[PDB]
């Protein structure tokens, strides 16, 4: 039914989002922002900050690929995976790319973006202390 969307988030998360959306057709006719919040629960915070009890997090946020990133990058991961899943669902609802070529391409793009986020920082030059100077310096006036 959804060969492309299965590749990205797996069949279990696919089943959950398809069931909660009301259908593959209903899933496709839905923006990626709403799909990311599919399955979200307004969990009560019991004397804790709203950050501790993950808000605005749905099935995609708890998917295997999204949960595999460090917690400081899981929001961007959830957004990107939700966008690509929306694209795959729109492709799937028309029963195109039944092989999964669109799904494989989207998963490869997601993995490349995740690797870029995990990329080690580049070498950054150390700025030496400025040499002391005694020459006169002319400075402008005005307002």
């Amino acid at each position: 039914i959804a060969p492309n969307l299965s590749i990205i988030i797996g069949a279990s998360t696919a089943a959950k989002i398809m069931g909660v959306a009301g259908g593959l057709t209903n899933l496709s006719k839905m923006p990626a922002c709403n799909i990311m919040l599919l399955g979200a629960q307004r969990k009560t915070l019991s004397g804790f900050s709203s950050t501790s009890v993950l808000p605005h997090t749905g099935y995609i946020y708890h998917s295997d690929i999204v949960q595999s990133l460090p917690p400081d990058l899981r929001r961007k991961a959830a957004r990107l995976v939700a966008a690509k899943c929306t694209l795959a669902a729109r492709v799937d609802s028309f029963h195109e790319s039944t092989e999964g070529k669109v799904g494989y391409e989207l998963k490869d793009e997601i993995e490349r973006k995740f690797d870029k986020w995990q990329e080690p920082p580049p070498v950054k030059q150390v700025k030496p202390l400025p040499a002391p100077l005694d020459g006169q310096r002319k400075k402008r006036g005005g307002r």
């Binding site: 915070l45 900050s49 709203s50 950050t51």
Partner: protein, 98 residues
């Protein structure tokens, strides 16, 4: 705290004065100190806007920014010192006074 609380401005004035007590004998100002003291002056200039922001934070704000920690090196034992954001500091000070 009611919107038309009678003692609302007195508590805000006390909180702002307590926040400014850290610079009473200061001679130089850090950029962070400059910004915080400018926030205090702005809150004093427009007490009602500051009170409205405080009520909005008390009603809706549940997530806060990180707090910096340092330790006063008393030779017997370390005493934690916490650095809260100035925007949240005003709300906390007013809440404590009230």
């Amino acid at each position: 705290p009611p919107l038309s609380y009678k003692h609302d401005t007195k508590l805000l004035i006390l909180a702002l004065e307590r926040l400014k007590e850290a610079y009473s004998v200061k001679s130089r100002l850090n950029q962070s100190q400059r910004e915080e003291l400018g926030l205090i002056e702005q809150a004093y200039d427009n007490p009602h806007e500051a009170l409205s922001r405080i009520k909005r934070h008390l009603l809706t704000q549940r997530a806060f920014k990180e707090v910096g920690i340092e330790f006063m090196d008393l030779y017997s034992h370390l005493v934690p010192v916490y650095d809260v954001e100035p925007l949240e500091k005003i709300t906390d000070a007013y809440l404590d006074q009230y």
